[PDB]
Ligand binder design. Structure first.
Ligand SMILES: NC(=O)c1ccc[n+]([C@@H]2O[C@H](COP(=O)([O-])OP(=O)(O)OC[C@H]3O[C@@H](n4cnc5c(N)ncnc54)[C@H](O)[C@@H]3O)[C@@H](O)[C@H]2O)c1
Ligand SMILES: NC(=O)c1ccc[n+]([C@@H]2O[C@H](COP(=O)([O-])OP(=O)(O)OC[C@H]3O[C@@H](n4cnc5c(N)ncnc54)[C@H](O)[C@@H]3O)[C@@H](O)[C@H]2O)c1
Lengths: 336, 336
């Protein structure tokens, strides 16, 4: 039971608010959109369809009622444009900022566009939000920000040197957010996501994340690569845990704001064990080679989620194996 | 004797190199331009005249020969435009990046503009320099990167939380520089300036620094305002000391790069002390109210310059009073 999250969602349905979701056409944004519309929220979406897709928005349309869909106002535009950011902020209560160009290797190969998207765009949205006096502001940060810190499991206060331009940009979001609290009284929540997965995570394209990239490949009958020795290990976090955490963050009591939280389940899986869970869930619905470590990649990864548990009453309820089970039917349909 | 510095400057007279100075029309930039043309160097300059001034360049022109000035190629443009950054990098040996919007309070009022210039702009010059494979890259960092850290004197490896949007931007310059070393092998030097003063520092405008602002006010018979009880203290650093450090860093051995250095004297002077020094020096060349502490003002600032002295062979040989003596005639001339 996700007790606190149930209670908060009940408040929202009784007293609905206006939400802004940036990155709404993407993986996490469109999952947020689906749950907020199902709570009868008014939703303002912004996306530029860089890595996001209109098909994600069309899919969410078919999953909600007509009245629910009628409260979604979609704005095609770019967070790099401050005017656009101010326009979409108007009358907004709760900001969920997901728009960014993700991926460590992308940042290495084009630190420039990435900087513009992830620092300039973040600041534009942060500043428009402060000026519009929104009730809350929650933004996607990253476990990449732990960098080379050798400690396991990862604890929020203890971070290392950032190991790529992507790590830098996300860390910069966090420091601007803190400076905003201290200089303006504008209290935010940053969510360090660990390896999120689930429906509508893009499997196509050179930057695909390991779960949908492998899922696709096994469905193709293609080779399943493994960047390095395979002992690299991760806290894979099903999207529903992330949706819980965004919504708990948006309605957090004030003293839980101006804080960073790990967003994950606290477990660890190696590239090598995941391969098998994926085969088994897929193989259940009727259907491997080693190589060089990837550049600027974090070696080993497990979150300590004690802080979200205690301060927000986060209750992660969906673990790697069940998330895969829940996720595979989506991949079959999308790829068939 | 500034002796490694003398050896380096003698060598440059004998073997000119091509330098890029961004912010060339500003206080520190035009002073670098002056030194470099007098050393017969080839200098590419870049400035948008946002806080810099064409009269600064006209002044440098009157101080160097026709043949020296003919080695100055000046481009009016903006570091926020990557193309411009690439163009001015061509043929460049040594980068001295000074272009930025200074001032903590400017950044509080308009964090967006300060971000675009200080982070986007800085990243464009760093990236173009890396791509051009220049010999050296040195950038203007800031003592505001110490933030709330309580150590005093300030030592480079120990820093705190940044306290304004400005401080965020200058800290991010350092982080990007370190990440560029790590990921592309491009090793830079960051110079944490402390309260620099001297000729061509702008006395006009909401954000003038204390030394020129007071100097101008005494020359006009305007009220000199002390923000607080005047026991507040700084490590005021004459320009020539900064010129020295820039040149020592452009020519540093490889082991001294990918390092941050404080640039200052090592001394502390109170606002009360300073107001007396300024008066004394001016009135030798011939011619006060207390109010509220500036809000969110640092109380005491003093640099440990051990690292610069040991690793770069820096000599902080101009202290505050001699610096004021050297600067006062330029203000007298400038304002009469
Ligand atoms: N999925 C994970 O494992 C993970 C891990 C760490 C951090 N994150 C962060 O989570 C957020 C959501 O990521 P996601 O996995 O859903 O990726 P995604 O690529 O699916 O979503 C990003 C969305 O933002 C939009 N966007 C990008 N730049 C934009 C711009 N300039 N203006 C407007 N829209 C823009 C894209 O079109 C896309 O719809 C991002 O900030 C990402 O950095 C995700
Ligand atoms: N003066 C100090 O005590 C001090 C203290 C800490 C750091 N610094 C840093 O030293 C550097 C030089 O500062 P300064 O005191 O000479 O200030 P300044 O304002 O006199 O000089 C900065 C120059 O940069 C130019 N510039 C700004 N934005 C630009 C852009 N986008 N494109 C092209 N040109 C641009 C301005 O027009 C100006 O000529 C800056 O990086 C400043 O932050 C100075």
């Amino acid at each position: 039971y996700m007790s606190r999250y149930e209670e908060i969602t009940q408040q929202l349905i009784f007293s609905p608010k206006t939400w802004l979701i940036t990155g709404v056409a993407g993986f996490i944004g469109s999952n947020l959109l689906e749950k907020l519309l199902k709570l009868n929220q008014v939703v303002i979406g912004l996306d530029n369809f860089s890595t996001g897709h209109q098909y994600n928005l069309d899919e969410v349309k078919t999953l909600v009622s007509t009245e629910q869909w009628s409260r979604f106002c979609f704005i095609e535009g770019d967070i790099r444009d401050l005017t656009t950011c101010e326009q979409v902020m108007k009358g907004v209560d709760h900001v969920l900022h997901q728009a960014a160009l993700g991926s460590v290797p992308r940042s290495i190969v084009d630190p420039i566009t990435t900087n513009a998207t992830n620092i300039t765009g973040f600041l534009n949205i942060l500043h428009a939000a402060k000026n519009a006096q929104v009730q809350s502001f929650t933004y996607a940060a990253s476990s990449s920000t732990y960098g080379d810190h050798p400690a396991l499991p990862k604890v929020e206060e203890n971070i290392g040197n950032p190991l790529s331009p992507y790590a830098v940009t996300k860390y910069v979001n966090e420091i601007y957010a803190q400076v905003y609290a201290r200089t303006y009284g504008f209290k935010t929540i940053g969510l360090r996501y660990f390896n999120v997965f689930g429906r509508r995570q893009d499997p196509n394209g050179a930057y695909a994340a390991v779960i949908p990239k492998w899922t696709a490949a096994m469905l193709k009958g293609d080779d399943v690569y493994i960047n390095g020795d395979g002992e690299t290990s991760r806290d894979f976090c099903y999207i529903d845990n992330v949706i819980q955490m965004n919504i708990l963050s948006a309605l957090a009591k004030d003293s839980a704001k101006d804080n960073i939280y790990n967003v994950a389940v606290g477990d660890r899986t190696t590239l090598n064990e995941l391969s098998g869970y994926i085969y088994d869930e897929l193989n259940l619905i009727h259907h491997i080679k080693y190589r060089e470590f990837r550049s600027g990649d974090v070696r080993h990864s497990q979150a300590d989620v004690t802080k979200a548990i205690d301060l927000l009453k986060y209750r992660p309820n969906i673990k790697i194996r069940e998330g895969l089970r829940l996720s595979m039917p989506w991949y079959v349909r999308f790829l068939k």
